[model samples]
Target: KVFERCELARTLKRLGMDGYRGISLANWMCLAKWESGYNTRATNYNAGDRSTDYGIFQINSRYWCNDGKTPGAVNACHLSCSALLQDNIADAVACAKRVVRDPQGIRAWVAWRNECQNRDVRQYVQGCGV
Candidate 1:
């Protein structure tokens, strides 16, 4: 229910899953459910550096943000960070898409899907109402 009304979910649905290879809407939804229940205002208690993750997907603002002091290289290279700051759903989807663009990442998604399949999981999903 939460997912159906969320901006992040809409963005992901519109973006399609192919770009993130092997990442079905169901697969990503599962992760999103765990991370934030599709709540853009969700936050984590002990998220990063002992705590404090924020945003829709709960992505660590410290790491993904431009602050070079957060254990990563800083650059205006991807000056598109504003998209993330404005809406975490966009950032989360973008991150997933980027990972999918990687051969290894797609392989990982396939592996995860296989794992789900092995556990008797079937590909199925319901957006707002079942």
Candidate 2:
């Protein structure tokens, strides 16, 4: 499931994610853009440990999602990795919020840590008017 950038922004706002639970919309949108470009079908396999990241937020099998193939996965989200790839996005959003509650916050997303951190990302929602 792919969403237009503005559409995604508006949807996130409607989902009460306009700075949802302390995560700014700017930061969430920025992370979404870099992590998977709003494509719910996105998946990435880490060669270092045979772990995989899934869905729009790129939830990782090592800690957040269960991919079955990854041994000793923590599955803190208590959901299958495939659930994050669905079009509805309810599960993905729920799990992502949990990820943010951790001490690392949005830094769990390497893209945010390296590319969006400390940078002004207002442009991410500029046209949405949300």
Candidate 3:
């Protein structure tokens, strides 16, 4: 499922992404925009590490979820990587919440640090009635 920007914004809010672990909805929107472009099935393989990033938030296989192929991965999310690819986004949202429980917080995603942090991210959720 490729969500429109506003559609994803509303969906994330309903899923409780807004202020989840001190991160805002617009920041989540910004992360998803840069990480997966709101595409539910997006997967990115890291050739150097033999890990993959899955779904809207691009949750990584290395430490968050189990893809069954990433070497020495720790499945902190305790769910199949496949779950993150579903259009429903519930699992992805769940895993994302789990991720922030770590010390890094939203900085777990380098994309968010590079593209979303300290920026005017509110535009990501603008004009969607959010």
Candidate 4:
């Protein structure tokens, strides 16, 4: 697991989102595990169609990276990118960080907290630190 997270950190560095290269993996991993059980292809019928969208970052497909149209569009890939390749996690984390950095986005992020059953998503990410 240590090697897995370290590998994820290195991938984050390559993507220029290294600020969360450390504990973000673990933090998101915790949440993702709760949501998707560490399975990149995991989904939950309880969430409805939205459940079909999730990855190592537990990112919902209807959100981040989903610009409605484009090859790499968030919805195009089902948000299930390989953990080893850092596909979905890289994009989702970078996108999530960007959202948390913005005021309006923070509110949305907060709501996501409730949806993910993590009332303090910000706290988790902040605790992860830079």
Candidate 5:
């Protein structure tokens, strides 16, 4: 499922994404925008690493979740990669929050650093009433 911009924004806020781990909703929005364009079933296989990125937030099979194929991978989020692909997004959101509990914080998603870090990310949630 692909989400409308404001709909996704409000949904994230409802899931307590705003100010999560000192990261704003807009930054999360920017990451999600670049990561999967808000498509719940989006998946990317890293041919070189033999791992895949899964779901709206593109959680990777190399570390955060497991697909039973990525050698030495860890399911630190304690959920299957399939859970991240659900239209409901509830499990995906929880895993995202868990990813940031590390000292790396939101930097776990490099897309955020490349696209959102040190930038005025307000546009992502500006008209969403978040």
Candidate 6:
């Protein structure tokens, strides 16, 4: 399922990520926009290294998730990559929390590093009131 921006913010807020680690919901919304455009089925492949990014959060196949055949995959979230393709994102949310707890925090996501970090995204969620 594709989410409207505000809808995504509301869901994230409901999931207790509104102000996680000082990362505002607005920033999260912006991250989602850049990472996957809010598409649940989004997947990006990197043939050079045979890596893949899955789901709206673009969790990497290199470590965070398993693609069934990616040897040495850490599978840190202990969930299948396919699980993130589904419209229901409960598992994705759970896994994202784990990712954020890592030392890199939200910067674990390149999109967040490039587009959200140090950027003012207050307008992203302004009228949503999230």
Query: Which one is best on lDDT?
Result: 3
Candidate 1 lDDT over 1-130, as tens digits, reads 2445334445677777522565556566555555566665665544255433444444543434343334443322242333443543555566556645655653334434554434422223544322
Two-way lDDT contest, 5 vs 6, winner: 5
TM-scores for the candidates? 0.54, 0.95, 0.97, 0.41, 0.96, 0.93
Candidate 6 yields a Cα-based lDDT of 0.86
Q: List the residue pairs that clash in candidate 6.
A: none
Clashing pairs in 3: none
For candidate 3, give the lDDT: 0.92
Is 3 or 4 the stronger prediction by lDDT? 3
lDDT of 4 by residue, 43-76 (tens): 3322444333445444444544342432434443
lDDT of 6 by residue, 10-103 (tens): 8899988777887777877888788899999999998877889999888888789889867568999999999999988888888888898899
lDDT of 3 by residue, 22-109 (tens): 7889999999999999999999999999999999999999998998999999999999999999989998999899999989898989
- Looking at model 5, which ten-residue stretch has the lowest summed lDDT? 121-130
* Tens digits of lDDT, candidate 2, 14-89: 7777776677798889988989999999999899999999999889998998989998799999999989989988
Model 6 compared with the native: what TM-score?
0.93
Q: Order the candidate numbers by TM-score, best to worst.
A: 3, 5, 2, 6, 1, 4
lDDT of each: 0.48, 0.88, 0.92, 0.44, 0.91, 0.86
- What lDDT does model 4 reach? 0.44
Tell me the tens digit of each residue's lDDT in model 5 across 1-130. 9999999999999999999878889988999999999999999998898999999999999789878889879899988899998899999999899899988998888888888888888888878887
Model 2 Cα displacement at 96 (Å)? 0.3
CA lDDT for candidate 1: 0.48
Q: Clashing pairs in model 1?
A: none
- Find the candidate with the highest TM-score and give its number: 3
Which has the better TM-score: candidate 3, or candidate 6? Answer: 3
Give the poorly placed runs of model 5, Cα more than 4 Å off: none
Model 4 earns a TM-score of 0.41
- Per-candidate Cα RMSD to the true structure, in Å, reads 5.4, 1.1, 0.8, 7.1, 0.9, 1.2
